[PDB]
Structures are given as structure tokens and as C-alpha cells.
Amino acid sequence: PVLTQSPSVSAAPRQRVTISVSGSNSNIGSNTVNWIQQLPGRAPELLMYDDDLLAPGVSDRFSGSRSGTSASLTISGLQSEDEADYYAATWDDSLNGWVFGGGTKVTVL
Amino acid sequence: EKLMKAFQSLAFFEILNMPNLNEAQRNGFIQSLKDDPSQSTNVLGEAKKLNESQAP
């Protein structure tokens, strides 16, 4: 994957976890990042866009950030329904198209 | 405007992660998404129906 995401994370309910992704100046370094939530057998859901903006209806427990060639997604007050795979997405000027990370599994104990 | 683009990324993601499609079918669907974004839904639907029909 063009984008490199953080390894799988397991946390108890009510904990705060932060997932990260790293890229280059051709993607993250120059374009805003989007975060996607993926549940088994379901369509992917847009959680955040423009680095830190919440898609309509998304819980404000999710927050985003971007600086340099990296970005991160923070989930506060983790819940059982937060267990899923989270993917980072951004535009790459070198490839002239969308690039995606490999995904990070968030497991709620 | 950024929101609509982000939403556009979703279809790309789904089609990129459909395991039962050929490389040519996948590439064709992606190219459809690039050439006519207003057809996104349609494309996706078709892709889905193909990915199900070619399941093992």
C-alpha cells in the first residue's frame, strides 16, 4: 500500500486509542486525509474528511489530525460497536488518483 | 466539495476490495468511476452483481 497504517490495536471499553498513517509529500504531505470504517460484510463508511471534519451523523468521539506526511485518527470512549477495520485514504498527485492504506483493526475487549 | 470527493473515494475503495473480480473487470470499473462520477452508484451496483455472480 502507498500509505502505511499502524498495527492492530486492542483496547478495553472507555479507553482512548489513536491510529496513525504515514505517506509522502505526493499524498499526505500535500492532500487532506479521509478515514473509512469497514465492518465485515457491510459497505465502507466515511468517518472523517479534510483531516479533521466529521461526516454527517458521525459521533464526535472520532477526531482526526494531519501534520507533515502523517495523519492519525483518535477514538475516545471506545465502544463495542467501534470494533472494526479503519482505513486511511488520500489523493496522490504522482499517481493522479486515490491511494489507500492497508487498514488497522481496532478490537474492543 | 471536499465531502463529495471523500464520498467518491468510498466507491473506489469498495471496488478495489472486491475479491471475485478479474483484474480487467476491476480496472474497467475504476476507469468508469473516473470518467463519469455521476454514474458511481450504477457502476458500484454492477460491480457488486458481478462480484457475487463469480463467487466460489
Tell me which residue of A16, A20, A17 sits closest to A5, measured CA to CA: A20
Question: Between the CA of residue A100 and those of A58, A86, A93, A109, B49, what are the distances in Å?
Answer: 21, 11, 13, 27, 24
Interface residue B54 vs chain A (CB under 8 A): no
Cα A33 to Cα A29: distance, rounded to the nearest angstrom: 10
Question: Between the CA of residue B10 and those of A98, A100, B14, B16, what are the distances in Å?
Answer: 10, 10, 6, 10
> In CATH terms, is domain B1-56 a member of 1.20.5.420?
yes
What residue has cell string 465502544?
A79
Burial label for A60, CB within 10 Å (0-12, 13-18, 19+), is exposed
Q: Given B6, B13, B16, which is nearest A49 (Cβ)?
A: B6
Cα A61 to Cα A74: distance, rounded to the nearest angstrom: 8
Q: Which residues pair with A99 in a beta bridge?
A: A90
What are the b/e assignments for A88-105, b being 16+ CB within 10 Å?
bbbbbeeeeebbbbebbe
- What resolution in angstrom units was achieved for this structure? 2.1
Cα A60 to Cα A57: distance, rounded to the nearest angstrom: 9
Residue spans of the domains in chain B: they are 1-56
Inter-chain contact A34–B9, Cβ cutoff 8 Å?
yes
Radius of gyration, CA atoms only, chain B: 11
Cα B15 to Cα A44: distance, rounded to the nearest angstrom: 11
Technique employed here was: X-ray
For chain B, the distance separating the N- and C-terminal CA atoms, rounded to the nearest angstrom, is: 40
Q: Are A42 and A83 in contact, with CB atoms under 8 Å apart?
A: no
Instruction: Give the helix, strand, coil percentages of chain A, each rounded to 5.
Output: 5, 50, 45
Q: Are A55 and A34 in contact, with CB atoms under 8 Å apart?
A: no
Q: Which amino acid is at A46?
A: L
Cα B49 to Cα A41: distance, rounded to the nearest angstrom: 15
Q: Given B3, B5, B14, which is nearest A44 (Cβ)?
A: B14
Which positions 31-70 of A are in contact with B (Cβ < 8 Å)?
32, 34, 36, 43-46, 49-50, 53, 55
Cα B47 to Cα B39: distance, rounded to the nearest angstrom: 12
